[PDB]
């Protein structure tokens, strides 16, 4: 019945009683009469539970036939099976090489989708070069091998993720890119070029996958620079930071500081030049001092995902696969 | 005081036993073990493969291609695959390998490819690894040979867990390794045990033994570039598989499985009997892409 | 009093990393920051263990298996914090010093 | 082995370097840092307390 009008009806998860019992006769009450009341370590107990579950899993569907068992639990490991795949590219069949192995990896839930992956990354100790952000790199993750454009960032104590220009020489580093969904806790591997031969070590970096999300939230530091032109003890007149009086009104009360380290506050706009303002400070300034304000600007990464198709090559050139080039090669 | 010392030693023994308890999902009837052979390009990978095969079956194999499945023992079968020096092949085999045999040139020393593969294995799950070093016949059974063995062994123990075996192949009699060394090497593969890896347990995977193209011939005549339907045969490993699922084939792309059906098992294990040794009937070789006897 | 110690008569113990309570709090003390919570496998007790140096936290993740030893002496070296009685020695049977110095790689 | 961890960290002894005045403002003089400002700041504080 289950596995062998109704639409536009109420979505109510209630079991209505089609034929209620009388509940006045004694015989009806009699039907429900019985329902009413008239030294091992913590490691040993855990081990005992697992063995009971292990026996239960094996000894559940042994009675049913193999064709029946497939419907309930699927094809078990240890079976010789035949798989039919459709829409295979033609270059796979014509350029088939028996030496190169063929592997079929089953995908989990949501692994076919794409998203933003946040990873913990460390440059390998034996690699000569370092990795620059926003340059293409190939990742070996899960079952897949693909080339993407990552962002390298560092974690702060307050929780802010600020962008890094390069991978640090000796430390772990956060990496974010646009690509397929992959379960947490898995390792990954980084190469620069699969094609060609190199005398040096070819493995660029190594780490683990940490996070999956739809937003990167990565931010970059931006500084607006100004120069004093008139000074009255603490109070100084600053030009060059802004170019209109509308700009000053947006940033009134912002914390500003000099290169020397004197901290100040934006107070009010000035009319005589276009974008000057009045700022008070802890101490008197000099003409040589340079003032700036610290701002954070969110960044973005392009969504570029190019899987490797080495098997879709003629027999002699399976080793030669190329993709987007880095800044140095260009 | 001796009882207290005995009490303390027992607790230290208990400490090593401790680990995360987990449900044992290993199959009742295991599939054949995947054995990979890699090394530097001209170290002797394919010569070693023939020696192990001749150690178990007596059946002739020529033009060895792709995976080869043989019966080695009453309760164990092995699938043997050679790994090329191409970096793409090295990455895929590390994901599927259950046992790794690494070949080292003792005369030349360590090379880049040996260390690169170890880093790959540590990323994707470390399998059981046994290193075999060859070309020991160049040495003259002197101080140089004794010290070279010790130097390579201590460096090898840093990459892998200590106590991992290094096997010595002295030399070839008539272009084949000595029978006693091969027989001893085959004994180690038989008695090895394997831990469950995280990625392999969670995801089902199959190493394909045979490929067959199933398309209408007239469609190929009309357009060679047409998409083609392909049938694949292999052993199911890792986890259960559903009828309609998404699968990733590295080097090609993502596909969805249309139809799935199980087949009677070739190269099957024998029905149990107390004969001292397996006769020629029980020793079987399955290799649809290799060519058995004289036919290819 | 053979089983008096928290390790049950042993010199070392094995635990599961629950959380990095120091990291979750946003205090940059570097003495709070190197405190992690582990659960001993033998008896299930929850203790707080100390990571030797900041930056070795990067090697440790949650749900990992670590080896914890006692913290016998030099307790006053850390800055004004009680409960310094445990320290993390190994993760995945690999010493933290080997991972920090770049002499070994963690096997997954 | 806390000291062993510190010794490994201090293997590299290159320190962060100081930035100079921009070229188009070179006639103004040297760009003063915190150490330069502290000399003139303490000098003014010294005189005001005496007055």
């Amino acid at each position: 019945l289950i596995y062998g009008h109704k639409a536009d009806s109420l979505d109510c998860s209630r079991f209505l009683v089609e034929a209620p019992h009388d509940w006045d006769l004694e015989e009806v009450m009699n039907s429900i009469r019985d329902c009413f009341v008239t030294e091992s370590t913590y490691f040993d107990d855990l081990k005992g539970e697992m063995q009971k579950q292990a026996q239960l899993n094996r000894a559940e569907f042994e009675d049913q036939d193999d064709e029946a068992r497939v419907q309930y639990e699927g094809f078990r490991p240890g079976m010789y099976v035949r798989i039919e795949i459709e829409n295979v590219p033609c270059e796979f069949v014509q350029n088939f090489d028996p030496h190169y192995p063929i592997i079929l990896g089953g995908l989990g839930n949501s692994e076919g989708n794409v998203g933003y992956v946040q990873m913990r990354l460390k440059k390998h100790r034996w690699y000569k070069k370092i990795l620059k952000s926003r340059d293409p790199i190939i990742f070996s993750v899960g079952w897949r091998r693909f080339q993407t454009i990552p962002l390298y960032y560092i974690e702060d104590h307050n929780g802010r993720q600020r962008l890094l220009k390069y991978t640090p020489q000796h430390m772990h580093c956060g990496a974010a890119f646009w690509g397929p969904i992959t379960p947490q806790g898995t390792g990954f591997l980084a190469i620069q070029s699969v094609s060609g031969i190199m005398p040096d070590f070819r493995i660029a970096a190594t780490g683990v996958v940490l996070d999956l999300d739809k937003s990167i939230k990565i931010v970059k530091k931006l500084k607006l620079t100004g120069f004093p032109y008139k000074i009255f003890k603490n109070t100084s007149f600053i030009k060059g930071m802004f170019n209109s009086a509308l700009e000053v009104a947006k940033f009134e009360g912002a914390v500003i500081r000099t290169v020397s380290g004197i901290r100040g506050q934006i107070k009010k706009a000035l009319r005589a030049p276009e974008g000057a303002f009045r700022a008070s400070f802890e101490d008197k300034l000099l003409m040589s001092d340079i003032v700036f304000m610290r701002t954070w600007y969110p960044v973005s990464i392009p969504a570029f995902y190019n899987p490797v198709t080495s098997l879709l090559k003629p027999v002699g050139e399976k080793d030669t696969w190329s993709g987007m080039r880095t800044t140095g090669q260009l | 005081v001796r009882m207290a010392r005995s009490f303390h030693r027992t607790q230290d023994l208990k400490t090593k036993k401790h680990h995360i308890p987990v449900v044992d999902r290993t199959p009742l009837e295991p599939p054949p073990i995947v054995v990979v052979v890699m090394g530097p390009p001209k170290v002797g990978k394919s010569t070693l493969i023939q020696c192990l095969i001749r150690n178990f079956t007596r059946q002739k194999l020529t033009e060895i291609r792709g995976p080869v499945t043989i019966v080695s023992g009453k309760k164990r079968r092995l699938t043997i695959i050679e790994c090329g020096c191409d970096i793409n092949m090295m990455i895929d085999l590390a994901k599927v390998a259950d046992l790794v045999l690494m070949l080292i040139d003792a005369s030349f020393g360590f090379e880049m490819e040996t260390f690169e593969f170890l880093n790959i294995c540590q990323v994707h799950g470390f399998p059981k690894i046994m290193g075999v070093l060859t070309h020991l016949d160049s040495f003259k059974h002197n101080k140089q040979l004794k010290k070279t063995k010790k130097r390579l062994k201590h460096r090898f123990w840093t990459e892998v867990y200590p106590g991992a075996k290094l096997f010595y192949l002295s030399g070839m009699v008539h272009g084949e390794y000595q029978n006693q060394e091969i027989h001893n090497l085959g004994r180690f593969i038989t008695v090895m045990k394997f831990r469950p890896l995280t990625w392999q347990t969670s995801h089902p995977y199959i190493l394909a033994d045979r490929m067959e193209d199933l398309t209408n011939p007239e469609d190929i005549r009309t357009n060679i570039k047409c998409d083609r339907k392909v049938s694949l045969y292999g052993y199911l490993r890792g986890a259960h598989l559903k009828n309609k699922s998404q699968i990733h084939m590295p080097g090609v792309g993502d596909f969805a499985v249309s139809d799935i059906s199980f087949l009677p098992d070739p190269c099957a294990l024998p029905e149990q009997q107390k004969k001292r040794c397996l006769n020629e009937k029980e020793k079987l070789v399955y290799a649809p892409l290799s060519g058995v006897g004289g036919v290819l | 009093a053979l089983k008096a110690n928290p390790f049950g008569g042993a010199s070392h113990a094995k635990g599961i990393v629950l959380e990095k309570v120091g990291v979750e709090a946003k205090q940059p003390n570097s003495a709070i920051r190197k405190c992690v919570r582990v659960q001993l496998i033998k008896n299930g007790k929850k203790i707080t263990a100390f990571v030797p140096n900041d930056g070795c936290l990067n090697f440790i993740e949650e749900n990992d298996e670590v080896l914890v030893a006692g913290f016998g002496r030099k307790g006053h070296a850390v800055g004004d914090i009680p409960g310094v009685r445990f320290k993390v020695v190994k993760v995945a049977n690999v010493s933290l010093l080997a991972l920090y110095k770049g002499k070994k790689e963690r096997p997954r | 082995m806390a000291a062993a961890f510190r010794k490994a960290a201090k293997s590299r002894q290159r320190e962060h370097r100081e930035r100079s005045q921009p070229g188009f403002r070179k006639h103004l003089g040297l760009l003063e840092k915190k150490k330069d400002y502290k000399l003139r700041a303490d000098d003014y504080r010294k005189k005001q307390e005496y007055l």
Partner: peptide, 20 residues
């Protein structure tokens, strides 16, 4: 065409303090 290992990989000195 053989890629021999470098001196750094052969002796995994790593972050070892420099001494006179």
């Amino acid at each position: 065409a053989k890629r021999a290992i470098t001196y750094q990989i052969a002796k995994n000195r790593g972050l070892t303090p420099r001494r006179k």
